[PDB]
Amino acid sequence: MIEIIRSKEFSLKPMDSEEAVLQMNLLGHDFFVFTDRETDGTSIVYRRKDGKYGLIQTSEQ
């Protein structure tokens, strides 16, 4: 049985995806939360095992 774990802080301090993914790779986590200082908005960086990375962008609706 799973638990869905609530966690906000990975790094919230705004940085590029390259920056985020960098640290995503340090944890070895399949994904990392970062905001992009451009707009200071939330964008998540994930490990695309195809040789890419999956970037998501949320600014609410």
49 backbone φψ class: left, alpha, beta (φ>0; ψ -120 to 50): alpha
Strand pairing partners for 38? none
Residues 16-35 close enough to bind a second copy by CB under 8 A: 17-18, 21, 29-31, 33, 35
Please report where in the chains the tokens 């970037």 appear, as a residue. Answer: 55
Residue whose CB is less far from a second copy, 26 or 51: 51
Does 7 sit near a second copy (CB under 8 A)? yes
Does 54 sit near a second copy (CB under 8 A)? yes
Find the largest Cα–Cα distance for the chain: 39
Residue 37 Cβ, how far from a second copy at the closest point, in Å?
Answer: 10
